[PDB]
């Protein structure tokens, strides 16, 4: 992970979810895609 | 994702499936014993050319049940053999390095037939034309 800003879809299994006030990437193709902010 | 695919593909040259890196891990992973496949596979390579990729087919289901296919040699192997060529042109359509008549082609179509889907012995012949065209064989009437 990199913390970043602005969220994009890295793979077809990034679900992309708004958890509290921060958009989280949770993925089920690779754990690699888990960007903390969008 | 559940992560299941049925009828998984594997691809290895005819004389290199005695060592494990050309076979990769997968044939072992769906529970098809590598020794029994290695012994069945060898029975069919004395007429197959070395370095030419032979199809091997494994199935896994969601409940970890598995089924396994070994196939009669490719139409590509027979089409090189019958025209007396070792390997293909390496350029599809425009480069010609030989020829195959239709009357031989129909015998090949009949030799691959349990894998071939075609509803006609002609429909099956029409499918192997474009394989002969990739390897630089011209299909003459």
């Amino acid at each position: 992970m990199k913390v970043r800003a602005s969220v994009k879809k890295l793979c077809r299994n990034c679900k992309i979810v708004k958890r509290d006030g921060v958009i989280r990437v949770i993925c089920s193709a690779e754990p690699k895609h888990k960007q903390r902010q969008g | 994702a559940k992560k299941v695919q049925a009828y998984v593909k594997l691809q290895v040259a005819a004389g290199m499936a005695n060592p494990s890196p050309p076979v990769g891990p997968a044939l072992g992973q769906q529970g098809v014993n590598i020794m029994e496949f290695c012994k069945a596979f060898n029975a069919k390579t004395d007429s197959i050319e070395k370095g030419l990729p032979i199809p091997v087919v494994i199935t896994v289901y969601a409940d970890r049940s598995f089924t396994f296919v070994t196939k009669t040699p490719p139409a590509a192997v027979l089409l090189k053999k019958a025209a007396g060529i070792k390997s293909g042109s390496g350029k599809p359509n425009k480069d010609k390095v030989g020829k195959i008549s239709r009357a031989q082609l129909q015998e090949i179509a009949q030799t691959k037939a349990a894998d071939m889907t075609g509803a006609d012995i002609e429909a099956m012949t029409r499918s192997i034309e474009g394989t002969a065209r990739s390897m630089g064989l011209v299909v003459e009437d």
């Binding site: 993925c27 089920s28 193709a29 690779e30 690699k32 | 994702a1 559940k2 890196p21």
Partner: protein, 176 residues
């Protein structure tokens, strides 16, 4: 929205006790299998669960499927009881339950304090085979979740505690 229109149709001898917003699912072979809907208002009817808007909220379809999924989940929960066979891969760890404590290693000299929720029980055939027991579909996956929490299946050599859907996609080691 496709799943806020499913009419559920609960089976016969299943007791579905509606307190208005609190719903309690009872029947033979389990106890305390329940759901609380808080964004949407939920009707039972006779058995055909009917979904509609709750006072002080504005969102639509969004939680109305969630409710459908959560009430049906509990109806599968009391009847048969949700799936139970849990297990883990990777040497010297274990996942042997002893009472209210689950014993595993991370090499630490403190207790890991992996502990059982008040909703579950367990027993073990072997020190790496676990049978988790209950009739609420959430609590079996909640204790499953604390047990995998720092022994999740790694994306490189794969070792970890294995339950439900899993993020590992496999890679092979580097050549030697």
């Amino acid at each position: 929205s496709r799943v806020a229109k499913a009419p559920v149709v609960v089976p016969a001898g299943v007791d579905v006790k509606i307190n208005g917003q609190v719903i309690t699912i009872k029947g033979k072979n389990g106890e305390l299998t329940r759901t609380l809907n808080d964004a949407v208002e939920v009707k039972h009817a006779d058995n055909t669960l009917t979904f509609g808007p709750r006072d002080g909220y504005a969102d639509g379809w969004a939680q109305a499927g969630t409710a459908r999924a959560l009430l049906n989940s509990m109806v599968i929960g009391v009847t048969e009881g949700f799936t139970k066979k849990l297990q883990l891969v990777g040497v010297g760890y274990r996942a042997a339950v002893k009472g209210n404590v689950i014993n595993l290693s991370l090499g630490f000299s403190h207790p890991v304090d992996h502990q059982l929720p008040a909703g579950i029980t367990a027993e073990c055939p072997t020190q790496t085979e676990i049978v988790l027991k209950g009739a609420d579909k959430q609590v079996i996956g909640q204790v499953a979740a604390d047990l995998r929490a720092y022994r999740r299946p790694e994306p490189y050599k794969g070792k970890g505690v294995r339950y439900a859907d899993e993020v590992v996609r496999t890679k092979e080691a580097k050549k030697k």
